[PDB]
């Protein structure tokens, strides 16, 4: 009981793939006079806490997802055009050193 919850805290916080909202513009170093709609995409990324320091939760295998969204480029030259972009979707993670 006293130890039931603690084990639950570990389990829930372990290194593993997690749904995050990735900012498209930043992920590809896109000039910010160029707007993405939506600005973000949902993908899974490795996250959580390792039990030593200098051990970081990293991806050991990655799938890639084609996603389509719209791109505005300001100062308004045109309306929004559809662009297809591939984002990393981590499928497995491990606490590794660096």
């Amino acid at each position: 009981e006293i130890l039931k919850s603690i084990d639950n805290e570990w389990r829930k916080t372990q290194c593993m793939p997690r749904e995050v909202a990735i900012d498209v513009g930043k992920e590809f170093g896109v000039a910010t006079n160029t707007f993405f709609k939506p600005p973000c995409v949902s993908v899974y990324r490795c996250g959580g806490c390792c039990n030593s320091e200098g051990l970081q939760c990293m991806n050991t295998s990655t799938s890639y997802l084609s996603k389509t969204l719209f791109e505005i480029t300001v100062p308004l030259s045109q309306g929004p055009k559809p662009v297809t972009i591939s984002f990393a979707n981590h499928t497995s993670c491990r606490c590794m050193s660096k």
Partner: protein
């Protein structure tokens, strides 16, 4: 009931109204406006929020400026119908200042390296186009500068570089910054001698 997808440009001005052009065939049609995400529904209150059928749905831009997309929706006898999705786009345009560094007294010997920074400070949701003027035939490098937080500005940099100047490079150097609806510029005289 409504005449692939559209676009709504919002001023972000917290009191100017915006019109979604959900045109109507039946001027006596009960139209609501859905926005997402999160999901909201706006009914005409007879005052600020209305639907003219000839114009479309009229609503204060601040009520839907959070949203990714909006659309008109009407019910007729237990069945509801939607217009085309409209993409919401909060653009800004306000340029505070455009400033050259160095700003004055620039003096080079022939063969020395000229470096001119042009910094533009703007409100949010602004994109900047830089345009230079200089004496006749220079590398340009534009980029974004980090700024905030809570500071309500964006900061843009354009850097002019001449690798080893010549007597012909003496003259007026002008940097202009354009947001789409507004342009501010600055300048400085560069002197060169042997």
């Amino acid at each position: 009931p409504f005449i692939q997808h559209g676009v709504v440009y919002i001023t972000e001005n917290k009191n100017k109204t915006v019109v979604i052009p959900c045109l109507g065939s039946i001027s006596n049609l009960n139209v609501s406006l859905c926005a997402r995400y999160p999901e909201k529904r706006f009914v005409p209150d007879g005052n600020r929020i209305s639907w003219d059928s000839k114009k479309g749905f009229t609503i204060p831009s601040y009520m839907i400026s959070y949203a990714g997309m909006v659309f008109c929706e009407a019910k007729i006898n237990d069945e509801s119908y939607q217009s085309i999705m409209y993409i919401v786009v909060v653009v800004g345009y306000r340029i505070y200042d455009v400033v050259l560094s160095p700003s004055h007294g620039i003096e080079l010997s022939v063969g020395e390296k000229l470096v001119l920074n042009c910094t533009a400070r703007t409100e949010l949701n602004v994109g900047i186009d830089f345009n230079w003027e200089y004496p006749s035939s220079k590398k340009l490098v534009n980029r974004d500068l980090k700024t905030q937080s809570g500071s309500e500005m964006k900061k843009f940099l354009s850097t002019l570089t001449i690798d080893g100047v010549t007597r012909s490079d003496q003259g007026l150097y002008t940097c202009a910054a354009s947001s789409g609806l507004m342009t501010k510029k600055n300048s400085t005289f560069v002197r060169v001698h042997e």
